[PDB]
């Protein structure tokens, strides 16, 4: 008695017509709003073919749970078509992001041992702390320079350089110098290419490669140029590290970074390692930086919450007697505030899985091989799933009612193919915010609501200018 697939509410079966109306009414850079509006229009489940790709969209955590309950051993998400086309056409070695089945599993398991396992990740603490402490020093320097007892500015560019320094430090065990007054321009080029690769992805999204070649010729060209900078720089770093290792040929007892571990004790070939280094580097720069910027924004918008997080951090530093490793298990509210930041400001608009087997959702039969998307952004703003969703309230994640948070913490995805950088990102952000909260109060002058723009990853729609006061 479950309804057939075609009875799922839908704007219609013409993908090109659907694409036309999406661009006309909402716009490519507002796909998150498109999702919100569609659930308002159709209810909690709908299907929409956009251009060539059809998906079923869900918002209800109970449906999300069923989706992930039926997951197979080698899950597949939606592959970004211009990314795939660039790698295939220009014959670039692929990493874990673009692989599937057994070849994906092979990379993933090798990578998990160096970047996910608690026994590997404990080594990240000193490397990430060093970078965050240097960030703090930059701000103290700018405050001194300003002569006003404070510093006001848009720090988005500093945050990109912070994220780059952090990911490179854990990968290479070496400082790139991106937080110094005089910066490596070739590393800045790498940073800028990552943003450009994301931004240029958007006009090609719902199109097959045959069409974006023909109607998005300039964008495709710019996109190819962004990825070329990414691969070229990453490959130089990796090759140089490989040869330096042989030049200094000493068996080190001290931790030397992820790459050292992979090259010395991995089942991965050098080519797989170099491909995955490229992805980790590119994945690390725009994700934590934007998420941290939103966190700072929410702290400035919610001064009482900022006070409570500071009070928690100071007590944890005291109780841990200064030790970072101990401290990180004593900041439950800070960690909750990160979940809360990702609820309202997800990096990823959706999660997606291709079904392995037929599946029923809300009395509708969804056939195997169908793409199903969980609308993460829409979920986070939905008042039936979160009390007062517009309010930044970290304590909602500590609720002893363990049905208030059921399948709600979805920012990094789920299961065996969840975010590969999740531990790096969680540790980088928590350590960053500990250092910031100990050192400054954050405010925004003339605070106004900052919206969101879809630039492949979700990002603030306009610049945010903070005021920092030393604490």
């Amino acid at each position: 008695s479950p309804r057939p697939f075609n009875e799922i509410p839908s704007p219609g079966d013409n993908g090109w017509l659907n694409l036309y109306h999406f661009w006309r009414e909402t716009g490519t850079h507002k796909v998150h709003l498109h999702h919100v509006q569609n659930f308002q229009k159709y209810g909690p489940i709908y299907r929409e073919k956009l251009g060539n790709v059809e998906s079923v969209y869900v918002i209800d955590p109970e449906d999300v749970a069923l989706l992930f309950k039926s997951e197979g051993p080698n899950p597949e998400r939606f592959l970004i078509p211009p990314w795939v086309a660039y790698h295939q056409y220009y014959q670039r070695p692929i990493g874990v992001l673009l692989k599937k089945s057994a070849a994906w599993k092979k990379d993933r398991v090798a990578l998990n041992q160096e970047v996910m396992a608690p026994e590997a990740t404990k080594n990240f603490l000193p490397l990430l702390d060093a970078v965050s402490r240097d960030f703090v020093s930059v701000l103290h320097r700018r405050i001194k320079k300003a002569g006003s007892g404070n510093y006001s500015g848009d720090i988005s560019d500093d945050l990109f350089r912070f994220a780059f320094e952090s990911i490179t430090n854990v990968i290479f065990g070496e400082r790139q110098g991106m937080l110094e007054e005089v910066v490596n321009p070739e590393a800045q080029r790498f940073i800028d290419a990552i943003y450009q690769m994301f931004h240029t992805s958007v006009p090609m999204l719902n199109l097959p490669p045959d069409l974006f070649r023909l109607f998005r010729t300039k964008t495709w060209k710019d996109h190819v140029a962004a990825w070329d900078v990414i691969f070229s720089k990453a490959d130089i770093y990796t090759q140089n590290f490989y040869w330096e290792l042989r030049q200094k040929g000493s068996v080190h007892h001290d931790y030397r970074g992820i790459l050292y571990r992979l090259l010395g004790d991995s089942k991965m070939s050098f080519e797989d390692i170099k491909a995955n280094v490229t992805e980790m580097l590119a994945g690390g720069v725009d994700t934590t930086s934007m998420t941290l910027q939103w966190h700072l924004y929410e702290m400035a918008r919610n001064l009482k919450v900022q006070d409570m997080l500071r009070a928690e951090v100071l007590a944890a530093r005291h109780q841990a007697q200064g030790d970072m490793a101990t401290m990180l298990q004593l900041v439950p509210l800070l960690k909750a505030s990160i979940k809360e930041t990702l609820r309202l400001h997800p990096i990823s608009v959706t999660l997606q899985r291709y079904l392995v087997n037929d599946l029923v959702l809300r009395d509708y039969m969804i056939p195997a091989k169908t793409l199903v998307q969980v609308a993460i952004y829409a979920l986070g703003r939905e008042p039936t799933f979160f009390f007062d969703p517009e309010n930044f309230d970290p304590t909602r994640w500590l609720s002893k009612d363990k049905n208030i948070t059921y399948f709600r913490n979805l920012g990094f995805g789920w299961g065996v193919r969840q975010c590969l950088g999740r531990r790096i990102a969680e540790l980088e952000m928590t350590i960053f915010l500990i250092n910031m909260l100990e050192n400054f109060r954050v405010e925004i002058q003339h605070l106004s609501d900052v919206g969101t723009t879809f630039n492949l990853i979700l990002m603030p729609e306009k610049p945010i200018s903070f005021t920092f006061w030393p604490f």
């Binding site: 998990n112 608690p118 399948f407 299961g415 065996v416 969840q418």
Partner: protein
């Protein structure tokens, strides 16, 4: 760990311990009886997060790959 037991003992459960003991899935999910539960060290924030997204949750359950 209880994962390494299932691995080299060669038990049944399909896809149990999919991430292979890196606290990066929740397929090693197991239910413990009261007297064994309190005997084990405090639960990390990371394990708690994985547990909230594990289907069929119990207040006496833990991740198999994190139990020595």
């Amino acid at each position: 760990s209880l994962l390494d037991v299932v691995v080299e003992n060669n038990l049944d459960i399909d896809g149990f311990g999919a991430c292979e003991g890196t606290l990066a899935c929740s397929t090693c999910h197991l239910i413990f009886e009261d007297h064994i539960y309190e005997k084990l060290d405090a639960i990390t924030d990371e394990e708690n997060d994985m547990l909230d997204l594990a289907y069929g949750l119990t207040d006496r359950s833990r991740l198999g790959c994190q139990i020595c």
